[PDB]
Amino acid sequence: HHHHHHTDPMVSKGEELFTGVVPILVELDGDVNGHKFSVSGEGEGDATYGKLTLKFICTTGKLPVPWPTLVTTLVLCFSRYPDHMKQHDFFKSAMPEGYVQERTIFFKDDGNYKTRAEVKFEGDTLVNRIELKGIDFKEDGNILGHKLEYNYNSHNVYIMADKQKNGIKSNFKIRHNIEDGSVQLADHYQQNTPIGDGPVLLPDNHYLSTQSKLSKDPNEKRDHMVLLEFVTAAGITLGMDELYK
């Protein structure tokens, strides 16, 4: 089930790079309130199903923030774009030279993450190399105090063209569950730009529908996170709905 047939050769180029199962490497260097930490992640992506399987390890000891706060930072090129939406897949069109992904994540009544990542192919491996700076976090807040539950919700995040930067932008709110029944809001602002000077596909407005399951490896003694995630593009339906009257 590797065969694909799209009339746009630019779509074909991106679909070819993502056929089958693609190995993934994630590298994060982070700093929060004077504490430096690093994370390494490995696994694979199957864009045909929008399916991601990744295991992350804190390579500096105990992670000083909760694992769920890093899920969005730690490869949207593995989203499943339906056939009628493949012309709007900016993420694959930027490959293999790749794209920069930058975010500010505002934790309400707490600090902010500023992140900058380069997502690109090194040979057959899709690599996500991240720098993270955590600014102005409360020592006893929900983040530095490790008060967030080890779970994750499903989201719909809206993607818009950023014409000025030849890329895309998005903002969306994530809510992290707290033990006492409250939630910690993480307001994400995001922009992506291509690394190379080659052409990219700039999308019409649409959204990505996400779902994620976090778990633990029972044989892993290091601080770690196992992530199973599915991402599907949606939100463009005029011509299609016509076909069914």
Q: Where are the domains of the chain?
A: 9-243
The strand ranges marked E within 49-166 are 51-58, 99-107, 112-122, 125-135, 155-162
| Cα radius of gyration (the chain) | 18
Q: What would the two tokens of residue 153 be? A: 């919700």
Q: Are strands 206-215 and 155-162 parallel, antiparallel or unpaired?
A: antiparallel
> Could you tell me whether strands 125-135 and 22-32 are parallel, antiparallel, or unpaired per DSSP bridges?
parallel
Technique employed here was X-ray
- Closest residue by Cα to residue 68 from 150, 189, 141, 146: 150
Resolution in A: 1.5
Q: Which CATH class is domain 9-243?
A: mainly beta
- Quote the CA–CA distance of 165 and 195 in Å, as a whole number: 11
